[PDB]
Design a protein around this ligand. Structure first.
Ligand SMILES: Cc1oc2ccc(NS(=O)(=O)c3ccc(Cl)cc3)cc2c1C(=O)O
Ligand SMILES: Cc1oc2ccc(NS(=O)(=O)c3ccc(Cl)cc3)cc2c1C(=O)O
Ligand SMILES: [Zn+2]
Ligand SMILES: [Zn+2]
Length: 592
């Protein structure tokens, strides 16, 4: 093991030779511990959103979010039992077939310094781009620096030689302030993963068109429609089981299966991806910021299995592995795989290959898969109790005894997916919309959080305006959110550009980051560009933009019907005016 990780620990040890020591009392049980060294340390409430959402002031979920994968929890420090030999064979056959299916039209390729620089710059507009970004360590600054690219080249040369000298990721046990040199090693490590494996996201290998089960690039506004289209396929209930800490359940077998994509690469690409897989994915070196009685320390730990949650390519490889694990469960449900097949070290391929070649693509079309998140509509309900391979692969379902059957839904609208459920709304003109929805306390609680501190009223109001505009595009069908959205947009200067991100979700397309008229953006998203909207007649007024049924709105967290809500709705112009007075002499517009 030290042959692959030695150089990295050696360099960390050398750079921190003053405070370096081996703590005999380290909390690590399943991660190899190498040593520690001394280190430094360091969310505000959005007063604009808070002032305009008074009824939610002390509401439990909202108050919780104000305080509250990157964290090194108890579950990260566990081992997953090794899958059985027949299970390992099935996974290998399925991984091989899946990669060949996913690569039928696309060819893997290297991603570039220019692609990375463009992504950094375009996302730097929305504030922070990375977890390691300080007020001194800007990704935009680093990307503009030729010295950063020189270090990248030097690390690549080591990777070409089958060695790694500086590729490390970080975890939380008040982020430690480090050197520009340390930050460059981190960003360079991310660029090198991006160069070798970024094609998966950049070339949309997991788009629905390319992967059948995938939803990458679709957007939150299409997710409900995809679930409604899956509902039309004949079969059993729709299952959406949650895996307890998916990333900790990624086995050495899963890692070796994900690696098979290198077989489709050109030699110069194959060489660099092979180095990312073998040296960094299969031999992780992690820095964990741990508090001690004297001060704060940084632990240098390492391990072979599990998913490096901090590493580029995680989404795609998680999506790949989940698609694979769900096909295997589908096969077990269909009686293709028995307990005796999973235990068998000489399991015959014929029937697994036959099922994949004849039913595989149809079976992928029955799923909506986004990383560890899955919705499956099997051919019948034998799937509910087909748990032998799922548990054996290590994908143990969250908060349910291992052998208790899964509970599915017979209504796609009850199905949870990507932190949402989706409703079908009838418009006054008879056209139907399929909208995303989540508990309202979660949306308001999120909107009340400002990312960091020292943010001026102007920057704060603009984040609020971004949240308000997201609500008008995605959550317009919630009475309280449309009202709060209209109040926020009325209180914030009309020509001020919404800045900073509202969400880090892969499904967010940020159509709300504009000064363009929200009704126009709404029409473009839900009517013009909506493929499930056959009649393109534009909606000319918000009065024609529908709401959830009163009962469904209330069930999903609405405060409508309460006195505190009625009082808020009536007194809202007063709160808007107060926000206006503090912002000052600017151009405002009344949206109430
Ligand atoms: C673990 C992690 O996942 C991310 C997922 C997305 C992002 N942000 S980013 O704008 O979208 C992005 C996404 C991909 C790449 Cl190569 C660069 C930057 C950052 C992280 C991150 C981290 O900074 O540590
Ligand atoms: C916009 C966006 O959100 C994400 C949310 C998650 C991910 N997953 S990712 O490959 O695993 C990843 C992991 C770590 C880092 Cl630093 C960047 C990206 C990627 C993106 C992404 C992108 O453009 O690549
Ligand atoms: Zn490296
Ligand atoms: Zn709802």
């Amino acid at each position: 093991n030290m042959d692959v990780i030695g150089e990295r620990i050696k360099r960390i040890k050398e750079e921190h030779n003053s405070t370096w020591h081996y703590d005999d009392e380290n909390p690590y049980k399943t991660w190899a511990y190498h040593g520690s060294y001394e280190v430094k340390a360091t969310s505000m409430i959005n007063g604009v959103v808070k002032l305009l959402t008074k009824p939610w002031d002390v509401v439990p979920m909202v108050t919780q979010m104000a305080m509250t994968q990157r964290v090194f929890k108890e579950k990260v420090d566990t081992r997953t039992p090794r899958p059985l030999p027949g299970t390992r064979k099935v996974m290998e056959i399925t991984a091989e077939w899946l990669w060949r299916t996913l690569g039928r039209n696309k060819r893997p390729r290297l991603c570039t310094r220019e692609e990375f620089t463009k992504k950094v710059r375009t996302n730097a507009a929305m504030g922070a781009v990375f977890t390691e970004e300080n007020q001194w360590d800007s990704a935009k600054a680093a990307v503009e620096d030729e010295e950063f690219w020189k270090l990248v080249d030097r690390e690549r040369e080591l990777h070409k030689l089958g060695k790694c000298g500086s590729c490390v990721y970080n975890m939380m046990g008040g982020k430690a302030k480090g050197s520009r040199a340390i930050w460059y090693m981190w960003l360079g490590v991310r660029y090198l993963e991006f160069e070798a494996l970024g094609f998966l996201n950049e070339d949309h290998w997991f788009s629905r068109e390319n992967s059948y089960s995938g939803v990458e690039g679709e957007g939150l506004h299409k997710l409900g429609y995809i679930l409604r289209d899956i509902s039309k396929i004949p079969g059993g209930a729709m299952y959406a089981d949650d895996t307890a800490g998916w990333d900790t359940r990624i086995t050495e077998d899963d890692l070796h299966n994900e690696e098979k994509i290198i077989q489709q690469m050109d030699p110069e690409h194959r060489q660099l991806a092979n180095a990312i897989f073998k040296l960094t994915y299969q031999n992780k070196v992690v820095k964990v910021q741990r508090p001690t009685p004297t001060g704060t320390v940084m632990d240098i730990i390492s391990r072979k299995d599990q998913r490096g949650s901090g590493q580029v390519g995680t989404y795609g490889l998680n999506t790949f592995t989940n698609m694979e694990a769900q096909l295997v469960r589908q096969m077990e449900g269909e009686g293709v795989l028995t307990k005796a097949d999973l235990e068998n070290p000489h399991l015959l391929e014929k029937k697994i290959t036959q099922w994949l070649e004849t039913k595989g693509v149809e079976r992928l079309k029955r799923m909506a898969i986004s990383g560890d998140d899955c919705v499956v509509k099997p051919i019948d309900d034998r799937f509910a109790n087909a748990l032998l391979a799922l548990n054996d692969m290590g994908k143990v379902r969250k908060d349910i005894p291992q052998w208790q059957p899964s509970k599915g839904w017979h209504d796609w609208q009850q199905v949870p997916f990507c932190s949402h459920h989706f409703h079908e709304l009838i418009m006054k003109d008879g056209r139907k919309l399929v909208v995303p929805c989540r508990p309202q306390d979660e949306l308001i609680g999120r909107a009340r959080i400002s990312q960091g501190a020292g943010w001026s009223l102007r920057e704060t109001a603009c984040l609020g305006k971004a949240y308000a505009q997201m609500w008008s595009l995605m959550y317009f069908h919630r009475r309280d959110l449309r009202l709060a959205s209209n109040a926020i947009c009325s209180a914030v200067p009309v020509h001020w550009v919404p800045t900073s991100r509202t969400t880090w979700s892969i499904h967010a397309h940020h159509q709300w980051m504009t000064t363009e008229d929200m009704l126009t953006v709404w029409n473009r998203v839900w009517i013009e560009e909506n493929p499930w909207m056959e009649d393109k007649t534009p909606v000319t007024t918000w009065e024609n933009v529908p709401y959830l049924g009163k009962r469904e709105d209330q069930w999903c967290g609405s405060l409508i019907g309460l006195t505190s809500r009625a009082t808020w709705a009536q007194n809202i112009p007063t709160a808007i005016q107060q926000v206006r007075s503090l912002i000052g002499n600017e151009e405002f517009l009344d949206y109430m």
